[PDB]
Enzyme design. Structure first.
Site, PDB file in Angstrom:
ATOM      1  N   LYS A   1      -0.177  41.699  -3.008  1.00 46.61           N
ATOM      2  CA  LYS A   1      -0.913  42.128  -4.181  1.00 46.61           C
ATOM      3  C   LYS A   1      -0.100  43.025  -5.097  1.00 46.61           C
ATOM      4  CE  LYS A   1      -4.458  42.693  -6.885  1.00 46.61           C
ATOM      5  NZ  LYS A   1      -4.966  41.587  -7.742  1.00 46.61           N
TER       6      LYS A   1
ATOM      7  N   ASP B   1      25.985  28.448  21.964  1.00 49.81           N
ATOM      8  CA  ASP B   1      27.108  28.086  22.803  1.00 49.81           C
ATOM      9  C   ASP B   1      26.563  27.273  23.961  1.00 49.81           C
ATOM     10  OD1 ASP B   1      29.505  27.820  24.184  1.00 49.81           O
ATOM     11  OD2 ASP B   1      29.901  29.954  24.405  1.00 49.81           O
TER      12      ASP B   1
END
Length: 1612
Positions: A114, A1193
């Site tokens: 807002k 990895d």
């Protein structure tokens, strides 16, 4: 309507005090009607909190609720063509005004969206309203609840609690999708328990498009591919491959041909193409200067301290700004300084020569206040200039240093002393040497570096460190600090900013430059042997990057000798590689950049490749980057040649290969010594955004501005769905077009359907199911100011000063209280600069324009000749004025400098004034403020003043009363854009607002996107969803330590077996994958929790990642405005302009994956798909690999029967794993000698220390609160560094470095301070409690003055253990303070009073004694409220050596003082007690003036022996004993062996036991634990509980054998 008669009498307790209640309630009573009652009968609270927030601020309430342009047109004002929005309260007079809103939420969730929309709504008015001749301060009223004064907070909740039935009764009696949003708006302070059921309680309306998303998305999946049909197609796929494309050569691997890649490296790095030399010093400009200094200076006083003292006095009196303008505020104390200089010339016969040519002045040079070399003669002009301008000047400015001043001024006569210039001419023409010169933009003689002895090799790095510290405190210069003369390839140097440094007792050096601040300067280095100047080079670099080596000469020396000492077997080869590596370290230290950095990291890939037996074939194609200078080649010949030196010898040079790999690897990680900072910000963020968007638009999914919640146009949706179905295309048997992101959706069906069957190593088990303020803009992230803060605090201080002068009618500003409120709420001349100097230059030039526009926005409040044509107004003045639209952001290359002198020099009228009037009342600044830089020497800022000065700134309504979409904003707390019926593609509220950020990793900038609050609110559930998934999984480690540890151990015992294992990574793992891939994975998941053996529902999971599928990644404005002036993305954004010419701000795409945003959800994909690829290999290649994955990895450990000839398999793995867009990086390595997993390189028989990373890590990240905590940081990092088995000697050298970092900072020293030097064992057995013990009890080396207080430690501790209480309530003997506690203890032990005499004058000086070193409670409380509640490394250190010279040390008396003043409260007490350690240990009579800071050391020693009894011990009491050989580098893993006597699981065992210790301390915020919860309640620096709630973190230590038998013992 049973309360409708009560509802009138309920708000009958609201007296019409104003017009806001009278007409509103007389229209309330005149009709009993429920049809507007939810609107008209509820808008009284829409009047109340409206007027109350207007009743708070300065506000005149327009009850009309009307627009901006007619509220400007009510007076006599032509309507300025404003856009029209709604404010609800004004303050309009003068030529500025106040628009104000009010918004109130109990959630953190859309309380921010807002205010963002509000300030965007009034700041799309800044383009048009500022051009009208009026500014505004758009203010907001943020509220968590309703804080009203005309009601007493007791009837508004009746209005929400009795009307909560009347809309149910009316919606039964009588709007539908504006019914439950009114319910969600009228909630209380919610503990709105949001779990995975968050999507369930909305409606699920659709788009009549997401059917095509599913039709593009879920077709090839059935989840029902039979496990026999997988084997049958996959065997035929392998048979297709092995005759298809293995043998015809489209693979990705080879056997590396270990000889050949050495030649490939030689042609890669050893740039025969280059024009570079062999001796490196000829090539780079700084190494020139270093080799100059260290081989023009190694071959080779009361007025000193008086001149330095009065110089620092000038520095202290300068930091005031009390000379009413910003130019004389240097020159009058310059007059003072030169008067003292001639008084020194009048002091002795040889005063200004024998101790000043060897001192601080050289030929035609004077050193003074800031760091200003001034080069005397000009001052002889300038005072003659100043007495030329004001002939009557030294009559008031002298005793304004007494009156309206502290009046502590040690000047003899030099205030009014207008000197004989002729007397100054005598010294000035006495000594003249050559003026200094600076250089912008062949011959060679530099002794051929390796043709030297090893002794002067450290004399190199001493000069390096000396010039390095000079570069460091180059930053320490003030950051605005504008000099006295402005204004090129080779410049004679008039007066320069210039640092210093010693070399020996006579000859010192300097450092010359002109630009103030952080950015790059063009340096110049002169020496002076005895006063005789010498230029010795002129280089160009940037200061904030050389923070590393400042005292690391011994540190790098320890590693440059230590790493070299790994070659104890090839002695002459070691004699070769030694000196070249040290020059290598020098050259890397010489040149920090990104290219030399990235290269030197990139050498391990080659090194793992030459170590193992298979690479990916494109690695050497990417292991070089182009040298932008001739400097990058210098490092790229040496270590590269060193690789050539000891990888391929002409004989069998693979002999001690393990030490070779270790050595060259630590050479390769010696990269990391470059401070990772990406040398500039604007060329980083564009590089990061180019790393972001290039594979995207190559894959072709760039769209332009969405609607930010939901709906799209057709065409952007079309290229959306085009990329979507192109993504999944990628058939199972095509070898070309394989580097394209996507997957065979039917081979995905093989993977996921074989997953649904329980023959993988993971399955759909899913234990314990997952079903359970200042906010910026988005376009400038990576910075530290939003634009909205830069109007927020402006409007706050403007409205605050708007109040102070209209109470009575002061009608004046204070020129420092206009600088006080901002300096307060962001971070009395001494009270300002007490913390004003605690900033950054980025913050400095921000604070300057904040000062500017607040002065402007207050100058607009009291507001109620271009014919002097020099240049063309329509070509210089007004053309640039309309091209800029702003006088403020005017650039510097569109004009020149002298036109900022001459048109600024217009003659005096009512546009100017004189007698500058530091009172400065408001409204007259138009002639008053303008002359402020007219009477300073500067020209730019007054030019901006003069160009901004002279007007260059030009029934249906009853049914829609129930608020529908046509009437949303008519309340404030109506909760407009909450989710009411969530979009298929959005959350009905936002569209996954993200932005850009980098991370500054070693080689490449890892990225981050900028989440909003609701975006993170959805991110949390998805990531913790996958966390509860991966907890039940077996082969992940993104958060599990245990499986990562087992991966480590089985990795090692595979490598010791001589077995084979891969090591991958993934090129662009981030930008590759898409959410819809993971939706398609989730489609054929069963996720049968063993609670309910049943397919769970995923619609809260599948329809939320549709919102991730359509995310809004923003753009930086710094990548946006850099593309505005004139690199394929830079090419692409310039053809977004030839479309609809909106600036490309909001960008949505398909295949994004914020890294760490949907990370673990890829990890299970990166788990399951890995195990699927691993699964075929047992049946397709009859071997058993095991594959771990840490989500980026991977590793597969291969078990081979009975050698790399089954490469048939291996690239085929790639050929499978490339099909699932988990692209094998060109950086991966597979073999059998070296395997990684996350920098843990597990080689045969040993394990890689990887020394220089941690060694670099200690020499980085020196961040700054206190020399306990700062030396706790490097204490921690030294624990980590000696965990890896480095040595002991390096550690102490780092400790000496950080000790000297304290000592240079002006803290002085303490035996707490930095940790000890020469620590031989203490790391292994024990935490900081033993380290501070060894540090303090090595002072008392004879072991006769502190064995007594350890006897007191036994007599206390064996009574305070179990078996006996013996005052477990010692709780208040200690807490009185320092001394009198120990006096109770020592008489409690059993002795005389004479020990209490002889001990308690052992004193040290504490500076955080009573409080802290204030540079802006016992810290025990902070450690507990940290664990229990759940700007580089250089640029803080300058705010550390500046906020230590301030007013810092406090007494309990309210007030502060200086460190040297405490050290001025000193005496000398040579009798054995002060003389134990100089300026460390004191006599009481040595501090008989100031003994309240003289806290005892032996008290803290006793408490240390108790903490050594707390956390461990029953050996720590005993006498330090005597030690009594092996290979030096036969290093090995040792175990802690800690004998802990406390009780474990402490996390509640201390928090509840704060009540039993001190009551108000936890009221506002066991057997033994509480007696040393009591040894850090009263003091601060023991280090007790922090390392017993957390753990030692290593428990596994490796060290050298020569650090074990060489270490001591302390047996009981």
């Amino acid at each position: 309507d049973e309360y409708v008669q009560e509802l009138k009498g309920l708000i009958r307790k609201h007296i019409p005090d104003r017009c806001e209640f009278a007409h509103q309630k007389v229209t309330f009573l005149s009709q009993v009607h429920p049809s507007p009652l939810l609107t008209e009968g509820f808008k009284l609270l829409s009047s109340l909190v409206e007027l109350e927030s207007c009743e708070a601020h300065a506000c005149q309430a327009n009850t009309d609720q009307r627009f901006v342009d007619v509220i400007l047109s009510d007076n006599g004002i032509l309507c300025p063509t404003l856009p029209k929005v709604i404010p609800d309260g004004f303050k309009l007079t003068g030529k500025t005004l106040i628009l104000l809103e009010t918004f109130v939420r109990v959630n953190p969730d859309e309380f921010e969206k807002k205010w963002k929309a509000d300030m965007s709504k009034l700041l799309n008015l800044k383009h048009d309203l500022q051009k009208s001749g009026v500014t505004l301060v758009p203010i907001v009223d943020g509220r968590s609840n309703y804080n009203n004064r005309f009601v007493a907070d007791w009837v508004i909740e009746r209005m929400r609690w009795l009307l909560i039935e009347i809309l149910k009764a009316s919606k039964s009696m009588l709007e539908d999708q504006e019914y439950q949003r009114l319910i969600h708006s009228l909630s209380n302070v919610k503990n709105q328990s949001l779990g995975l059921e968050n999507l369930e309680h909305l409606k699920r309306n659709s788009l009549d498009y997401d059917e095509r998303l599913n039709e593009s998305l879920f077709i090839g999946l059935k989840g029902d591919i039979r496990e026999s049909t997988v084997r049958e197609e996959l065997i035929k796929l392998k048979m297709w491959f092995k005759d298809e494309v293995f043998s015809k050569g489209l693979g990705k691997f080879k056997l590396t041909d270990r000889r050949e890649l050495l030649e490939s490296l030689s042609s890669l790095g050893a740039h025969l193409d280059s024009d570079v030399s062999s001796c490196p010093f000829c090539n780079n400009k700084l190494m020139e200067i270093v080799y100059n200094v260290t081989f023009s200076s190694v071959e080779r006083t009361n007025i000193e301290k008086h001149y330095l003292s009065v110089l620092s006095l000038c520095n202290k009196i300068k930091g005031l700004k009390v000379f009413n303008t910003r130019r004389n505020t240097l020159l009058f104390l310059d007059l003072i300084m030169v008067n003292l200089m001639v008084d020194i010339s009048e002091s002795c016969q040889d005063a200004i020569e024998s101790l000043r040519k060897s001192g601080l002045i050289v030929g035609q040079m004077v050193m003074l206040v800031n760091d200003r070399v001034l080069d005397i003669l000009e001052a002889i002009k300038l005072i003659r200039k100043k007495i030329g301008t004001n002939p009557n000047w030294v009559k008031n400015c002298s005793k304004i240093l007494e009156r309206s001043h502290p009046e502590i001024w040690l000047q003899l006569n030099t205030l009014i002393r207008q000197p004989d210039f002729n007397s100054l001419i005598s010294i000035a023409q006495y000594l003249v040497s050559d003026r200094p010169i600076m250089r912008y933009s062949k011959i060679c003689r530099h002794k051929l570096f390796q043709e030297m002895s090893s002794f002067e090799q450290m004399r190199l790095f001493k000069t390096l460190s000396s010039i390095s510290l000079s570069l460091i405190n180059s930053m320490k210069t003030s950051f605005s600090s504008r000099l006295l003369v402005n204004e090129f390839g080779n410049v004679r140097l008039r007066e320069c900013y210039a640092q210093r440094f010693y070399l020996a007792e006579s000859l010192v050096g300097f450092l010359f430059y002109q630009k103030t601040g952080e950015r790059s300067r063009c340096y110049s280095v002169y020496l002076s042997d005895n006063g005789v100047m010498s230029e010795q080079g002129s280089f160009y670099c940037d200061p904030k990057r050389f923070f590393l080596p400042v005292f690391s000469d011994e540190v790098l020396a320890g590693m440059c000798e230590e790493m070299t000492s790994w070659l104890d077997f090839d002695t002459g080869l070691m004699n070769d590689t030694g000196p070249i590596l040290r020059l290598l370290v020098l050259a890397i230290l010489c040149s920090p950049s990104k290219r030399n950095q990235t290269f030197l990291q990139g050498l391990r890939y080659f090194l793992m490749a030459f170590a193992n037996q298979i690479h990916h074939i494109d690695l050497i194609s990417k292991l070089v980057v182009e040298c932008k200078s001739s400097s990058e080649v210098v490092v790229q010949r040496l270590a590269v040649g060193l690789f050539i030196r000891l990888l391929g010898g002409e004989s069998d040079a693979s002999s001690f290969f393990s030490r070779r790999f270790k050595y060259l690897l630590n050479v390769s990680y010696l990269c990391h010594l470059i401070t990772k900072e990406t040398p500039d910000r604007l060329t980083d963020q564009i590089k990061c955004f180019e790393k972001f968007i290039e594979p995207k638009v190559k894959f072709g999914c760039a769209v332009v501005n969405p609607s930010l919640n939901g709906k799209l146009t057709v065409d952007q949706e079309d290229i959306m769905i085009n990329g979507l179905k192109k993504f999944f295309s990628k058939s199972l048997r095509d070898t070309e077009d394989v580097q394209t992101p996507g997957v065979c959706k039917e081979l995905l069906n093989y993977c996921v359907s074989l997953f649904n069957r329980g023959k993988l190593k993971v399955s759909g088990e899913l234990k314990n199911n997952p079903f359970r303020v200042v906010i910026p803009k988005l376009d400038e992230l990576g910075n530290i100011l939003s634009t909205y803060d830069k109007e927020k605090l402006v409007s706050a201080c403007v409205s605050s000063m708007a109040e102070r002068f209209k109470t009575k009618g002061r009608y004046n500003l204070d020129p420092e209280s206009t600088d006080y409120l901002i300096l307060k709420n962001l971070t009395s001349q001494e009270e300002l600069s007490l913390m004003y100097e605690t900033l950054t230059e980025e913050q400095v030039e921000s604070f300057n324009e904040i000062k500017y526009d607040v002065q402007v926005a207050l100058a607009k409040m009291a507001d109620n000749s271009p014919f002097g044509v020099m240049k063309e107004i329509r070509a210089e003045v007004s053309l640039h004025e309309v091209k800029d639209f702003d006088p403020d952001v005017l650039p510097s290359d569109v004009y020149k400098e002298l036109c900022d002198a001459v048109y600024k020099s217009s003659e005096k009228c009512n546009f100017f004034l004189e007698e500058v009037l530091d009172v400065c009342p408001l409204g007259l600044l138009l002639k008053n403020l303008t002359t402020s830089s007219y009477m300073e020497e500067e020209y730019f800022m007054c030019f901006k003043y003069l160009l901004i000065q002279g007007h260059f700134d030009q029934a249906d309504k009853l049914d829609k009363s129930y608020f529908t979409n046509a009437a949303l904003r008519n309340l404030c707390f109506y909760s407009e854009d909450s989710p009411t019926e969530f979009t298929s593609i959005s959350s009905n509220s936002g569209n996954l607002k993200f932005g850009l950020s980098y991370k500054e990793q070693v080689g490449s900038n890892r990225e981050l996107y900028v989440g909003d609050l609701n975006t993170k609110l959805m991110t949390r559930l998805v990531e913790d969803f996958s966390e509860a998934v991966g907890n039940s999984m077996k082969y992940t480690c993104l958060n599990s330590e245990k499986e990562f540890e087992r991966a480590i151990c089985d990795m090692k015992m595979a490598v010791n077996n001589g077995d084979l294992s891969c090591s991958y990574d993934h090129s662009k793992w981030g930008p590759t994958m898409s959410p819809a891939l993971f939706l398609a994975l989730l489609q054929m998941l069963e996720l049968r929790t063993p609670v309910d053996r049943s397919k769970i529902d995923l619609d809260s999971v599948k329809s939320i990642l549709k919102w991730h599928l359509h995310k809004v990644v923003e753009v930086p404005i710094n990548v946006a405005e850099a593309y505005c002036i004139g690199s394929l993305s830079e090419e692409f954004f310039h053809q977004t302009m030839q479309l609809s010419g909106q600036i490309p701000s909001h960008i949505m795409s398909v295949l994004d994956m914020g890294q760490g945003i949907l990370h673990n959800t890829s990890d299970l994909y990166g788990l399951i798909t890995e195990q699927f690829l691993c699964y075929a290999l047992d049946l397709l290649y009859d071997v058993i690999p095991v594959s771990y994955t840490s989500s980026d990895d991977q590793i597969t450990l291969v078990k081979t029967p009975s050698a790399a000839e089954w490469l048939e398999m291996i690239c085929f793995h790639e050929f499978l794993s490339s099909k699932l867009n988990k692209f094998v990086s060109p950086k991966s390595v597979i073999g059998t000698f070296v395997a990684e997993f996350k920098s843990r390189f597990f080689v045969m028989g040993e394990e890689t220390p990887l020394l220089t990373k941690f060694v670099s890590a200690a020499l980085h990240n020196v961040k700054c609160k206190t020399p306990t905590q700062l030396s706790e940081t490097i204490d921690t990092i030294c624990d980590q560094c000696i965990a890896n088995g480095v040595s002991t000697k390096i550690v102490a050298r780092i400790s000496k470095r950080v000790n000297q970092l304290i000592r240079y900072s002006g803290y002085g020293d303490t035996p707490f301070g930095a940790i000890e030097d020469q620590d031989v064992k203490d790391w292994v057995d024990g935490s900081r409690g033993y380290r501070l013990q060894r540090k303090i009890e090595a002072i008392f080396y004879d072991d006769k003055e502190t064995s007594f207080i350890r006897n007191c430690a036994r007599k206390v501790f064996n009574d305070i253990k179990r078996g006996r209480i013996f005052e477990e309530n010692l709780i208040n003997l200690i807490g009185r303070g320092g001394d009198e506690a120990l006096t109770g203890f020592l008489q409690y032990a059993g002795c005389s009073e004479q020990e209490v005499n002889r001990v308690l004058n052992y004193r040290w000086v504490n500076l955080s004694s009573f409080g802290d070193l204030r540079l802006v409670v016992p810290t025990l409380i902070k450690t507990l409220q940290s664990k229990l509640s759940r700007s580089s490394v250089a640029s803080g250190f300058i705010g550390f050596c500046k906020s230590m010279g301030s007013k810092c040390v406090r007494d309990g008396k309210g007030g502060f003082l200086y460190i040297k003043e405490v050290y001025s409260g000193i005496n000398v007490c040579i009798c054995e007690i002060c003389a134990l350690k100089p300026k460390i240990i004191y006599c009481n009579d040595s501090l008989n003036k100031v003994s309240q800071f003289s806290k005892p050391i032996l008290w803290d020693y006793f408490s240390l022996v108790l903490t050594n009894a707390c956390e461990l011990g029953e050996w720590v009491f005993s006498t330090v004993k005597e030690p009594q050989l092996n290979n030096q580098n036969f290093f090995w893993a040792v175990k802690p062996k800690v004998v802990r006597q406390i009780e474990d699981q402490l996390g509640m065992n201390h928090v509840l036991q704060s009540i039993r210790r001190n009551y108000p301390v936890l009221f506002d915020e066991l057997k033994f634990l509480d007696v040393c919860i009591a040894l850090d309640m009263m003091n601060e620096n023991l280090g007790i509980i922090s390392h017993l709630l957390k753990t030692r973190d290593n428990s596994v230590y490796i060290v050298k054998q020569s650090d074990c038998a060489l270490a001591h013992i302390r047996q009981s």
